[PDB]
């Protein structure tokens, strides 16, 4: 029933402006810093100078620490509906952070990656390819990535089944890639993104390992995906309260990953998606 929310639903423009105002006030007065990402040795590991992970929630890598690898990746944990670390929101890896991306995926036991960008968008590099191609395994440091299968779920979503081998162990990792997110604006409808989230959840199954979600910066589109999944988990567990607030969910996300849900158009798209889920 609380899905009441629809009965309650320029309003959205004002609401997004309030999210921006509140999150900016929190950056200024709250426990919020970017010390690690600004260290000289880490600056080159950031795709964008204005996107640094907050120290408070940053992903601290330990895999291969004994072999001298740094703890740093541009990525943050985001809490899920049970208060556990349910998402890792990170950037699209650079040539020199590919190895770190796989350390992240391996260390935290990630089963599903959601990628919400293309390698190149409108003539600009946005993400390095970290997956293998047909009959062309990819060696990245000590990781060997093999392509087992590729499947288009619909015209906008690719599913890759990967075999990832490290230190004599092989794991299955599924990667879902959204293939048509526009350079300006948002998708024509929420349907195919919802299909992506639905499939990710089937592949994830039970168990606490985080979903790995990324776009190019790891902010806007990434925050849309994490929020849609968070709200869908509330819905499926019958835990939408009568005072459910999408505003509060997005604001909370913004305190964990910088600029989670970056634009008014993204916020409106998220509203459209949630309304559709609520029927």
Numbering used by the authors: 6 to 8, 10 to 15, 24 to 293
Quote the study on this structure.
The ∼280 residue PTP catalytic domain consists of an α/β structure, and biochemical and structural studies have led to a detailed understanding of the catalytic mechanism (Barford et al., 1994; Zhang, 2002). Key features of the domain include the PTP signature motif, the mobile Trp-Pro-Asp “WPD” loop that in the closed conformation positions the conserved and catalytically important aspartate residue, and the phosphotyrosine recognition loop. Here we report the crystal structures of 22 PTP domains, including two tandem-domain RPTP structures and a detailed structural comparison of this protein family.
In the first category are TCPTP, SHP1, SHP2, BDP1, LYP, PEST, PTPBAS, DEP1, MEG2, and GLEPP1, which have a “PTP1B-like” accessible pocket that harbors a basic residue corresponding to Arg24 of PTP1B. This pocket has the potential to accommodate pY at the +1 position as in PTP1B or potentially other acidic or phosphorylated residues in positions N-terminal to the substrate pY. PTPs with particularly high enzymatic activity against generic substrates were RPTPσ and PTP subgroups R5, R3, NT1, NT2, NT3, NT4, and NT5.
